[PDB]
Design brief:
dna binding protein, binds the ligand Cc1c(CN2CCN(C(=O)C3CCCC3)[C@@H](C)C2)cc(F)cc1NS(=O)(=O)c1ccc(F)cc1, about 250 residues, 11 helices, structure-based design, mainly alpha, RORgammat, 3 strands, rorc2, binds ligand 4Y5, about 60% helix
Length: about 250
């Protein structure tokens, strides 16, 4: 619901529901990502990626980001109250928030011991993506993933945190702002309750500064839009109203 006086029953069910929605919309399960860390690209395979053209790497990365976004839209549609919002407000929250959630989820695929990331079956450093010529942007994404990875999120924590990244009533363009404030309030209450119950409140002060995630996503989507205008990826749109806002 979106109602006031949210009981302990509603709060604890909000936690379990959001956590269920999170794991059922993850392309890769956490145990498979952790188990694949020892599977690292050799020097000849990394050279194979570096000798691919700008457009071949752009096509690979863009198609995987398209899937990551589609999974996040499924996650958002499972959050209680979200599908009851207008199509305008759903699209306003997803346009800003969807890629911000993808950027947070990336910390699961980041290994801080050797600074590598999961990409197409194995782990590799940022040198793997040299043909794209986005070493400054990609270095920022590696840094943000490193800082989040040092928090050691549980599955409940990263699920609630990404739910609050989406359910934000301060996105410009919301026509039912009050209603999104009520959903955000209850998710904050469940997040703070869960952190307090599990003695994990110390992560609150370590969360990325408010504005850092929006700024990084802004630089990231700007670059993707520039790449899409020079070499358009053909997408079979799963959510055509949202697609229309980002592509046409
Ligand atoms: C692959 C990966 C990166 C590096 N990526 C460089 C290329 N890129 C660009 O956006 C480029 C920069 C502008 C042009 C494209 C992003 C995909 C980030 C960082 C990270 F923290 C996790 C992952 N693994 S992951 O498993 O989380 C994952 C794999 C593939 C995905 F698509 C999404 C996540
Ligand atoms: O074994 C312990 O040491 C222990 C101590 C406290 C809590 C605890 N219960 N709690 C409730 O809201 C609550 C209450 Cl008051 C009645 C029935 C059931 C609950 C439940 F946890 F299920 F919500 C909390 C809220 C915030 C922070 C907390 F730490 C708790 C706990 F679950 C275990
Ligand atoms: O209906 C669909 O299936 C669908 C799939 C992905 C998006 C999507 N793409 N996207 C990109 O930045 C992106 C990606 Cl991931 C790859 C190549 C080109 C782009 C471009 F930059 F052009 F939008 C987004 C950024 C924020 C919020 C989004 F919802 C998206 C979309 F809007 C709809």
């Amino acid at each position: 619901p979106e109602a006031p006086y949210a009981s302990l029953t509603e709060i604890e069910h909000l936690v379990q529901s959001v956590s269920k929605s999170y794991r059922e919309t993850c392309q890769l399960r956490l145990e498979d990502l952790l188990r694949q860390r020892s599977n690292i690209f050799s020097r000849e395979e990394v050279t194979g990626y570096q000798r691919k053209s700008m457009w071949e790497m752009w096509e690979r990365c863009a198609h995987h980001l398209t899937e990551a976004i589609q999974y996040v839209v499924e996650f958002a549609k499972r959050l209680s109250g979200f599908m009851e919002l207008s199509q305008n407000d759903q699209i306003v929250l997803l346009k800003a928030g969807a890629m911000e959630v993808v950027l947070v989820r990336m910390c699961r695929a980041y290994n801080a011991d050797n600074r590598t990331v999961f990409f197409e079956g194995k782990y590799g450093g940022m040198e793997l993506f040299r043909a794209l010529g986005c070493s400054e942007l990609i270095s920022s994404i590696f840094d943000f993933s490193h800082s989040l990875s040092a928090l050691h999120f549980s599955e409940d924590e990263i699920a609630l945190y990404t739910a609050l990244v989406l359910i934000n009533a301060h996105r410009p363009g919301l026509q039912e702002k009050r209603k999104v404030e009520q959903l955000q309030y209850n998710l904050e209450l469940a997040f703070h309750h869960h952190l307090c119950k599990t003695h994990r409140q110390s992560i609150l002060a370590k969360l990325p500064p408010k504005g850092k995630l929006r700024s990084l996503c802004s630089q990231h989507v700007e670059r993707l839009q520039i790449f899409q205008h020079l070499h358009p990826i053909v997408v079979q749109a799963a959510f055509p109203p949202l697609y229309k806002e980002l592509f046409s």
